[PDB]
Design a protein around this ligand. Structure first.
Ligand SMILES: CC(C)CCC[C@@H](C)CCC[C@@H](C)CCC[C@@H](C)CCOC[C@@H](CO)OCC[C@H](C)CCC[C@H](C)CCC[C@H](C)CCCC(C)C
Ligand SMILES: CC(C)CCC[C@@H](C)CCC[C@@H](C)CCC[C@@H](C)CCOC[C@@H](CO)OCC[C@H](C)CCC[C@H](C)CCC[C@H](C)CCCC(C)C
Ligand SMILES: CC(C)CCC[C@@H](C)CCC[C@@H](C)CCC[C@@H](C)CCOC[C@@H](CO)OCC[C@H](C)CCC[C@H](C)CCC[C@H](C)CCCC(C)C
Ligand SMILES: CC(C)CCC[C@@H](C)CCC[C@@H](C)CCC[C@@H](C)CCOC[C@@H](CO)OCC[C@H](C)CCC[C@H](C)CCC[C@H](C)CCCC(C)C
Ligand SMILES: CC(C)CCC[C@@H](C)CCC[C@@H](C)CCC[C@@H](C)CCOC[C@@H](CO)OCC[C@H](C)CCC[C@H](C)CCC[C@H](C)CCCC(C)C
Ligand SMILES: CC(C)CCC[C@@H](C)CCC[C@@H](C)CCC[C@@H](C)CCOC[C@@H](CO)OCC[C@H](C)CCC[C@H](C)CCC[C@H](C)CCCC(C)C
Ligand SMILES: CC(C)CCC[C@@H](C)CCC[C@@H](C)CCC[C@@H](C)CCOC[C@@H](CO)OCC[C@H](C)CCC[C@H](C)CCC[C@H](C)CCCC(C)C
Ligand SMILES: CC(C)CCC[C@@H](C)CCC[C@@H](C)CCC[C@@H](C)CCOC[C@@H](CO)OCC[C@H](C)CCC[C@H](C)CCC[C@H](C)CCCC(C)C
Ligand SMILES: CC(C)CCC[C@@H](C)CCC[C@@H](C)CCC[C@@H](C)CCOC[C@@H](CO)OCC[C@H](C)CCC[C@H](C)CCC[C@H](C)CCCC(C)C
Ligand SMILES: *C/C=C(C)/C=C/C=C(C)/C=C/C1=C(C)CCCC1(C)C
Ligand SMILES: *C/C=C(C)/C=C/C=C(C)/C=C/C1=C(C)CCCC1(C)C
Ligand SMILES: *C/C=C(C)/C=C/C=C(C)/C=C/C1=C(C)CCCC1(C)C
Lengths: 228, 228, 228
């Protein structure tokens, strides 16, 4: 493994794998149907990331994109991961607050646009246009963060204190960690090329494990996930 | 931009972009959960088309398919657009009439078959077989149009007059505009090659903007989208 | 058709096509909304398989994957089929028993992991790593079979005798036929290469037609699909 970023791909694979097994074991026995939804969503998220980390580690999830005069290593498997795991994370938030279905559809669809335009930007061979896709994807992310802070103002007169409390923490966790991903992309291998791929891969590893396994530990340890 | 169809890709990009912003602004403030569903579906549709028009304009959504002795320019991004936006359009219709879930699943699944076989036909290198996929996809479209006219005969004893009225108009808009897409494909660059790609791109632009932004203006201006 | 497996691809195409038309005709007239769900799911399943069998027959769904020193014919279209039809089959089971939504999401997501890791294994160029993906996919299949036997223990105090009976038979049909697919893959063209592709294609044809058209005949002939 002649790619120096292999260690972070291996560590990411192991930590997503271990978080999947932990959440699997923890959700055994659970009969509350509301809690079963949260365990299924929250366990699927690092299970999908485990498979995509492994595909990067083994090289399957890596391709070379010509741009800027250069053959650029691009890990496309990250977008196949995020396509599914970032709407699932939004679904955990949305279920906490009993979101209306129109709000869930706005969130999941804005998130698909965010990930799909991120992927088009990652694979685009004209260097300047990569950053046009980055901006569109960021605009979709900002929409999602707007909805998470301002789209549930009908949900407060009626929201169990423990649901509000856990939703607040997870929403803060989300806004901080997810906002770092466009920055990493912009300065890393896919963007300006200021931070080398080895470091980029480290940064996404720490973000992903926090946003998936850290997030899910907070959620699944709360009694907000059970019907009262 | 040495592709003469660039002007229609640019115009399509702008009109889908402007229709997205208009519907975004128009749906601000809306609290009625039924109306929020219609705004989310109807706003996502031109937002997705904006991204796919832009990918065609920038060249990312174009590939060359050998067939007929020739390297043929094929805009595959149209199928990535339609994969999502044509079930969303069907969902707006189906929600208007309070469709049963089995009818929604038939519609969304027939539509996936329509778009996916359209894409296989667009990328098929044996010329005669392209038209086998065209026929299968047309058969799926005809099924969808059948369901839209004859699959909601339990929904009339109970259907607000304004819902019936808006559903009738949008269903007519749909049947007329969607039926033109197999014809354009059959005579255009993907099919018989009778109409040049520049004109084909113009035709799909006018159809798409009408079927997305025209459709959505009719829907979102009606009080059929609000619970009574 | 210089591929000896063409006959089984042609036969599979015809049998999925004929089963689609039969289920289409059989579900005409059905007004019971619960029954309409089962007809839509169960009819879409062989309709999707018909398109994917046809794409294999015509060669579109075939690619060459280098591994083991060799250019290996890999029918990738099977994974595009299964991506949709295996969650749909699980949905028919889950609706029979009135599964909780968290259980449905676990099933559909485990199934996506099963098919997507199966596809990564089928396309992986390092021979030994193909079998790592096979094992992960098998682990997801075993999870699905676990849930089908042990995830509905809240659903028995309340389950119409005819629903229990039909669910039991279809679940047995599923466990036996689906468990054969990793074995065929492991000994066939995608794995160890012990069984030639011609025979492999025969085996998957018999499995698919049984698991789709055989399964659906059992389901759609039962009164378990109607609300009582
Ligand atoms: C063992 C049986 O587990 C059933 C229940 C409780 O255990 O899991 C149910 C837990 C959840 C409701 C299911 C969410 C997804 C599951 C974890 C199924 C996917 C399994 C993956 C193949 C795990 C990936 C490998 C791992 C080592 C990361
Ligand atoms: C609910 C159910 C009932 C639904 C039923 C399913 C229904 C659709 C029936 C099955 C049809 C279909 C799924 C199967 C055909 C797959 C098709 C894409 C195959 C083409 O790809 C094969 C290759 C190489 O030979 O061609 C070359 C590849 C091309 C150059 C690429 C062109 C294709 C586009 C890239 C498609 C874009 C779609 C994206 C995957 C959408 C998400 C991506 C995003 C978030 C960035
Ligand atoms: C000029 C540029 C270089 C800067 C780029 C910024 C840009 C990308 C936008 C990001 C802003 C965003 C992170 C802020 C949103 C979170 C927070 C401020 C929201 C406040 O509201 C929530 C409150 C109360 O419930 O809790 C508060 C929740 C938390 C306690 C808020 C704490 C914020 C985080 C601690 C900051 C993230 C830390 C990084 C992940 C560390 C990486 C840096 C590295 C080089 C060591
Ligand atoms: C500004 C905040 O808007 C929140 C509400 C009302 O405004 O939008 C909510 C409107 C809908 C419920 C959400 C439907 C999809 C959204 C428009 C989110 C996608 C945004 C896209 C990135 C827009 C594409 C770019 C544009 C210029 C075409
Ligand atoms: C709800 C959630 C819990 C679900 C969890 C997600 C779960 C599936 C886990 C993730 C696995 C998976 C999504 C990730 C792997 C992606 C896989 C397709 C990668 C293969 O493609 C990489 C390339 C180049 O190196 O190979 C060469 C490319 C090949 C030649 C092409 C073969 C692949 C097929 C084309 C696949 C067909 C699927 C279609 C996109 C379906 C729709 C298309 C249609 C409508 C026309
Ligand atoms: C032989 C071939 C060349 C012809 C190909 C036809 C074939 C592809 C099938 C298409 C038929 C389809 C469009 C008809 C369905 C719509 C309509 C007749 C349905 C009637 O029922 C609805 C009624 C009452 O509510 O309103 C009625 C709704 C509307 C008022 C109906 C009006 C029909 C449209 C005005 C026709 C479409 C116009 C084109 C988009 C213009 C493009 C032509 C260009 C060259 C100028
Ligand atoms: C004819 C009209 O049928 C409407 C109703 C009852 O017939 O079908 C409704 C039946 C189901 C509710 C719909 C399930 C999917 C449909 C069969 C629509 C897909 C049609 C495909 C294109 C069939 C593929 C070709 C075939 C020869 C295999
Ligand atoms: C609900 C709605 C509102 C949602 C709105 C949709 C929203 C996402 C907006 C549309 C964006 C997007 C869908 C369109 C862009 C498609 C994008 C994949 C195009 C890239 O592919 C083009 C090629 C050749 O030029 O590049 C080369 C190809 C690369 C080498 C491959 C890299 C891409 C990955 C393979 C993507 C993996 C995703 C898988 C299809 C997931 C399932 C596969 C699995 C089960 C094995
Ligand atoms: C060492 C290896 C080579 C063996 C590999 C096995 C491995 C892949 C795991 C598979 C085990 C699995 C098929 C068993 C599950 C089914 C069954 C035993 C479950 C019992 O519980 C259900 C009961 C009561 O309702 O009905 C019972 C339901 C049925 C009546 C059970 C009958 C089992 C099937 C008849 C066996 C499958 C037959 C094959 C499809 C035939 C192909 C062989 C060919 C070479 C002729
Ligand atoms: C599980 C992994 C998580 C939570 C990942 C989140 C990823 C994003 C918020 C990605 C955002 C991006 C942009 C806004 C701009 C373009 C680059 C992306 C895709 C990295
Ligand atoms: C937003 C864009 C809309 C409403 C597009 C609709 C597209 C169709 C109805 C496409 C149909 C096709 C056929 C029936 C045959 C094969 C060619 C297609 C995909 C163009
Ligand atoms: C309609 C076709 C059906 C029911 C197909 C089922 C396919 C599976 C159960 C496939 C399973 C696989 C594994 C568990 C290991 C990797 C190889 C696969 C994808 C064939």
């Amino acid at each position: 493994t002649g790619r120096p970023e292999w260690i972070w791909l291996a560590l990411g694979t192991a930590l997503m794998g271990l978080g999947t097994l932990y959440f699997l074991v923890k959700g055994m026995g659970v009969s509350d149907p509301d809690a079963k939804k949260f365990y299924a969503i929250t366990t699927l998220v690092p299970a999908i990331a485990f498979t995509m980390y492994l595909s990067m580690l083994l090289g399957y999830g890596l391709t070379m994109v010509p741009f800027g005069g250069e053959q650029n290593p691009i890990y496309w498997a990250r977008y196949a991961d995020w396509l599914f795991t970032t709407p699932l994370l939004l679904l955990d938030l949305a279920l906490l607050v009993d979101a209306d279905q129109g709000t869930i559809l706005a969130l999941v669809g804005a998130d698909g646009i965010m990930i799909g335009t991120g992927l088009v930007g990652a694979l685009t061979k004209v260097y300047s246009y990569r950053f046009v896709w980055w901006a569109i994807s960021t605009a979709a992310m900002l929409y999602i963060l707007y909805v998470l802070f301002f789209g549930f103002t009908s949900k407060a007169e009626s929201m169990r204190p423990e649901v509000a409390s856990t939703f607040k923490v997870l929403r803060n966790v989300t806004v901080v960690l997810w906002s770092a991903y466009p920055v990493v992309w912009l300065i890393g291998s896919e963007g300006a090329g200021i931070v080398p791929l080895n470091i980029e891969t480290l940064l996404f590893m720490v973000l992903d494990v926090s946003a998936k396994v850290g997030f899910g530990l907070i959620l699944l340890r709360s009694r907000a996930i059970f019907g009262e």
